[PDB]
């Protein structure tokens, strides 16, 4: 089970929805995002302080072999409720 | 809201289907999600004719 819809993080700048990290749960099992998938690379503290309000500057990246490789870009991200 | 990362490459469970919907345009991938009787959501390629026929069957009930 890996072809299920996954929770993503929202942004304020009108761009593509992105995954927190490069993994996601379906049916209780963890699956890996595909290579090239857009993701956020958050620090531990950012994950802990993430809310449904923009309050955090998230490093954008692309998934590569299960890691969120930063592309140098930053955007405000926050939980969809 | 939620987005699909992979398409279900197998046969669609027509008779277990309850409903279907379309993911947001803001998702990286276009997808049709099927929702089964027992709550499982299945991402599906909207260009696959099998997927389209499943939606047609379900909506015509």
Numbering used by the authors:
A (entry chain A): 23 to 103
B (entry chain B): 8 to 68
The authors write:
In the EVA-A:chemokine structures, the side chain of the chemokine CC + 1 residue (Tyr in CCL7; Phe in CCL11, Leu in CCL16 and CCL17) sits in a deep hydrophobic pocket within the evasin structure, possibly enabling the ~35° rotation of the chemokine relative to its position in class A1 evasin complexes. Notably, this “CC + 1 recognition pocket” is defined by several hydrophobic side chains and by the Cys22-Cys51 disulfide bond, the fifth disulfide that distinguishes class A3 from class A1 evasins. Moreover, we found that mutation of Cys22 and Cys51 to Ser, giving EVA-A(C8), resulted in significantly or substantially diminished binding affinity (or loss of measurable binding) to most chemokines. Nevertheless, this double mutant co-crystallised with CCL17, with the only structural changes being in the immediate vicinity of the mutated disulfide bond. Thus, it appears that the key function of the unique disulfide bond in class A3 evasins is to structurally define the CC + 1 recognition pocket. Second, the additional disulfide bond of class A3 evasins enables the formation of a deep hydrophobic pocket for binding to the chemokine CC + 1 residue. EVA-A accommodates this residue within a hydrophobic pocket, which is formed by the disulfide bond that defines class A3 evasins as well as the side chains of residues Leu39, Tyr44 and Tyr57.
